[PDB]
């Protein structure tokens, strides 16, 4: 298994082209555990492998890039994922994180509360989500599209993600949403990525690379999630932390990607070409302001 030296495994294109029915996820390696470097947390290992994978894609990387991270709080009250993102991202990158409960973070700004209580008029270049509700998993009922925080993620992408931007959203067998898969078709490229350290889990990151703001391809989310599970059920992934031992090429290379403010009437086919190659970001560059709502009562 040559995949063991990779940071993880991306869903092969042929699996994306099937029309499968949703089945239970039954992983062969379920229960196994990867051997992490001494004293390293699973959350640190997982995010390190996600970033090592993102390095191989055509992410747009402007000056003073804007990154937002959802579901960043751990049970212990810290933000391991945020620490890895800050290590990975160019120095000076604006990094904002968020979660439902309080936690200590290395982010430039931390937002506590749900989506309905936070607001910004600013656009972002990269969205990372580790949001996940453990009570979502229920094997005694049908596995339908989830319509909670995922509806907010979809709304955030379609309104606050800059053209040329990218996303990495955590999903699982039971934590998923049909509209989010459909929205993957609005990017120049997409995949479902499984980290090698957590390959015994149904977890994956839906990765949308270079947002076009329009459907490049029509994707049925119900079918694509079924395709994802079929892939996982028929392709055992060997648990591996091998990639964690070589961090020499870890930092995201600065590309100094151009940021331009254009209108929908100016987005021609040559602009789409630049967006698709991660050579352009379309958004304004105003001061970044985030609002936090407070319900007041006596």
């Amino acid at each position: 298994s040559s995949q063991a030296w990779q940071p993880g495994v991306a869903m092969p294109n042929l699996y994306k082209m099937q029309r499968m029915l949703l089945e239970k996820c039954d992983l062969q390696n379920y229960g196994d555990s990867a051997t992490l470097p001494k004293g390293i947390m699973m959350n640190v290992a997982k995010y390190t492998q996600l970033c090592q994978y993102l390095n191989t894609l055509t992410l747009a990387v402007p000056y003073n890039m804007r990154v937002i991270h959802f579901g960043a709080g751990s049970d212990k009250g810290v933000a391991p994922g945020t620490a890895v993102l800050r290590q990975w991202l160019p120095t000076g990158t604006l990094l904002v994180d968020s979660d439902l409960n309080d936690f200590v973070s290395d982010a430039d700004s931390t937002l506590i509360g749900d989506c309905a209580t936070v607001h910004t008029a600013n656009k972002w270049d990269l969205i990372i989500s580790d949001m996940y509700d453990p009570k979502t998993k229920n094997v005694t009922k049908e596995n339908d599209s989830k319509e909670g925080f995922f509806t907010y993620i979809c709304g955030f992408i379609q309104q606050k993600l800059a053209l040329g931007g990218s996303v990495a959203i955590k999903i699982t067998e039971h934590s998923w949403n049909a509209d989010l898969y459909k929205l993957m078709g609005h990017f120049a490229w997409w995949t479902a990525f499984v980290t090698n350290v957590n390959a015994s889990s149904s977890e994956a990151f839906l990765i949308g690379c270079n947002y076009l703001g329009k459907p490049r391809e029509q994707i049925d989310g119900y079918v694509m999630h079924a395709n994802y599970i079929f892939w996982r059920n028929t392709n055992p992934i060997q648990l591996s932390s091998y990639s964690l031992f070589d961090m020499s090429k870890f930092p995201l290379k600065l590309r100094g990607t151009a940021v331009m403010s254009l209108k929908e009437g100016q987005i021609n086919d040559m602009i789409l070409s630049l967006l698709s190659k991660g050579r352009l970001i379309i958004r304004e560059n105003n001061r970044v302001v985030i609002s936090s709502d407070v319900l007041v009562n006596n």
């Binding site: 470097p37 640190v44 212990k76 964690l244």
Partner: protein
């Protein structure tokens, strides 16, 4: 605050855990506090905020302005003291010339 922790260690004092240890090459400059992990062969790098007593306890920082020199940065700790990063950062201090830990890398003499 910082005084109580020193004495808390006595009588089987439990050291603050869950400090976020980072993956790195361990071929860094070895400086105390940096914008990215800079641990050498004898150090571990941790996310700054998770090693700051003031951040962890959700209390004000000693500077009148309220600035934290750990949050958003990485702190290098000797591998021998990696079991207690918060404690090590309190006790020791950084050299304002070379930016190394005093008695743990600093040799401006």
């Amino acid at each position: 605050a910082a005084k109580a922790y020193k004495d808390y260690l006595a009588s089987g004092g439990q050291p603050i855990t869950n400090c976020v240890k980072m993956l790195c090459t361990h071929t860094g400059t070895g400086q105390a506090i940096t914008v990215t992990p800079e641990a050498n062969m004898d150090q571990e790098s941790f996310g700054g905020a998770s090693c700051c007593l003031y951040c962890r306890c959700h209390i004000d920082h000693p500077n009148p302005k309220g600035f934290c020199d750990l949050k958003g940065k990485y702190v290098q700790i000797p591998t021998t003291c990696a079991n207690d990063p918060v404690g090590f950062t309190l006790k020791n201090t950084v050299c304002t010339v070379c930016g190394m830990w005093k008695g743990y890398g600093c040799s401006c003499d």
